[PDB]
Structures are given as C-alpha cells and as structure tokens.
Design a protein around this ligand. Structure first.
Ligand SMILES: *[C@@H]1O[C@@H](C)[C@@H](O)[C@@H](O[C@@H]2O[C@H](CO)[C@@H](O)[C@H](O)[C@H]2NC(C)=O)[C@@H]1O
Length: 38
C-alpha cells in the first residue's frame, strides 16, 4: 500500500517514472542527488 511518487518526489522539476517498489526521479543532464536536488 501507499506509493513513493505522489507529489513529484524530485526537488528540481524532474520527471517521475515507474519502478520496482521505488520511485524514478529523472534529474537534469549533469545533475546529482537522489531526489534531484544536489
Ligand atoms: C522528464 O524528464 C525531465 C528530466 C525533464 O526533461 C522533463 O521536462 C521538463 O518537464 C517540466 C514539467 O515539470 C516542464 O515544465 C519543462 O518545460 C520540461 N523541460 C523542457 C525543456 O521541456 C521531462 O518531462
């Protein structure tokens, strides 16, 4: 139950996709971080 990608998990205006029991935060080209922020 419950998901991970509800209100855009990313923190840099990244694209969210589908994954296996996880979230898919697609950061920009040449970025860093897990939730697209660093
Ligand atoms: C999904 O992948 C991301 C890495 C981005 O390239 C996304 O594109 C951007 O999506 C936002 C939506 O919040 C939009 O506002 C931007 O204009 C768009 N970027 C460009 C250059 O179109 C992509 O969908």
């Amino acid at each position: 139950d419950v998901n991970e990608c509800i209100s855009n998990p990313c923190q840099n205006d990244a694209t969210c996709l589908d994954q296996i029991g996880e979230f898919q935060c697609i950061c920009m080209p040449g970025y860093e971080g897990v939730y697209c922020e660093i």
